[PDB]
Design an enzyme around this catalytic site. Sequence first.
Site, PDB file in Angstrom:
ATOM      1  N   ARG B 229       0.905  -1.290  -0.148  1.00 46.41           N
ATOM      2  CA  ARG B 229       0.148   0.233   0.059  1.00 46.41           C
ATOM      3  C   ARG B 229       0.288   1.017  -0.035  1.00 46.41           C
ATOM      4  N   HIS B 277      -2.225  -0.470 -10.311  1.00 46.32           N
ATOM      5  CA  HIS B 277      -3.048  -1.445  -8.778  1.00 46.32           C
ATOM      6  C   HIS B 277      -3.655  -2.825  -9.744  1.00 46.32           C
ATOM      7  CE1 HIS B 277      -4.962  -1.015  -4.714  1.00 46.32           C
ATOM      8  NE2 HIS B 277      -4.704  -3.209  -5.402  1.00 46.32           N
TER       9      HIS B 277
END
Lengths: 311, 309
Positions: B229, B277
């Site tokens: 993250r 992502h």
Amino acid sequence: FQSMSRIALVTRLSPEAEAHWAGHLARALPGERIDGFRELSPAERAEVDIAIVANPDPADLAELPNLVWIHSLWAGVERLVAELGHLARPIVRLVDPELARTMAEAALAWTYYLFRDMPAYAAQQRARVWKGLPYKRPERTTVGVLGLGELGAAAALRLRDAGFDVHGWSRSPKEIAGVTCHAGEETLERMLGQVEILVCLLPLTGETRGLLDARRLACLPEGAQIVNFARGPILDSAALIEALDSGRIGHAVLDVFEVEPLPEASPFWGHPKVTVLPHISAATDPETASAIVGAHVADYRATGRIPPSVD
Amino acid sequence: SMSRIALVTRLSPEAEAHWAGHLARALPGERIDGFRELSPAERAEVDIAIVANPDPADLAELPNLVWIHSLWAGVERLVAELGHLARPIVRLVDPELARTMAEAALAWTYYLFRDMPAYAAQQRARVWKGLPYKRPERTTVGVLGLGELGAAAALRLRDAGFDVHGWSRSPKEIAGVTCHAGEETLERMLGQVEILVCLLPLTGETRGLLDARRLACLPEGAQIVNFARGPILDSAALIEALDSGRIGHAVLDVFEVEPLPEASPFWGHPKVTVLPHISAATDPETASAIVGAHVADYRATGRIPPSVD
């Protein structure tokens, strides 16, 4: 005085690439006198009995009288044997027992490069575009391997163990577990028909020169992607370019070319759907390569026996 | 009169449509539309939102919304961000995720290991030049995080031949992998890792874990892959480490704002590979059936599936 022996390193690599090799060779062959060709005076050149080479300039090799034999740093010396057969000095290729492993690794790494859409993401990054692409699992992804010799088979087994739906083609029958194997030119087009990613690992002969021509490329599904680790002439260059442009072929990873170094004017360099690699899929690490040259050289100093050479 | 489902994402249109198609198959009885396609009357009918990085502004335009199904496994961002709605959020626990993430770890380690960025840079400059290879066995690869994802990834890397090191906060033993435990051992672990793959969850103990100091612990030229993250890694510190040569390259998949805005410096940075992502990438065929079962069970029983809180 007793006359003295020495080794010339004769390449047309970048100076830093040559120096990287010199350093490794010096480690593998302490006591031999190894110099870049450029560093040797005319007297010193006449002392040279072994040339260690990588795409040497023939003009340099001709300036070494008393040369006995040649050790290539490369596995593929086909260019060289044609260029230099006439010097009548045995040419020894670098044969690495781990080549199959390393080539199988490369097949997998570059299948992943295509499968995981790395090129497209790179292109999008350059345009500052954020855009995830559809993922499907390896098991629903068909990967073709042309050539099922030692390299093609090793490659097929890595791909298989990665989960891909692997198809194999060879001219003769082959049976590899968990891989659908196709035999003979008759089955080729049916095989190409089902394959999303094609990895080429065929040897170059009369029957394989131009095997991937305009017709055969058209047999692949629209958007199919190709990886050429075989030789330039297996694949029709101009036909590949037209197939790339039209969208028939989505991307091509090319490691091998009819002319090497690939000339600056090749359209492959600039082409958006092409990834150019400088003939390195299967390369040996220089430590290992050097130690093999070392052992060959040491055996000749001990026995006067030239290692097994090429025709 | 009737119910309906809204598909609310900030994915590419073709990625959203890929999901719509699969979800439609898994849920043939239901009415599923992209948020943009629904009129204000139709929006008032929506009771379930199926989401992937939704725009909260869109979710707020669905009044009689009851619950949300994420297409992603990590919804920590979302639960906090959508706290104001106080509506259940259901994550996708997908069995194939570990396999797919481990695949990705391997593929992008190979991208770095095999020198693909450098060959690409040479290709753009029309430079023909083979680079030194060394074997995987002489190449140390670090994995940060040894949960289900990090452990799977470590095993793929191990079986590829790499010299694999693992770090986690708790003790953990994985065969054929050198495992390190606790923040105390982290710097000694970073110290011998040429390629670092990040698979840590975001918590209090991991925010800013890869700061200026910790990045400096890596060997010169070390390359990083961030599948974790954004807040695990200090952005400005990474950029300075890239510029100085301390860190050789960084593959980055995760950002606190997605889509990554056009003005991020990461886009134009020559030692950075930006991925959109694709650590959330999952075969929708498999995933859709899990959403389907959850949706079907709520239509049958009125039971919201176990949510996060």
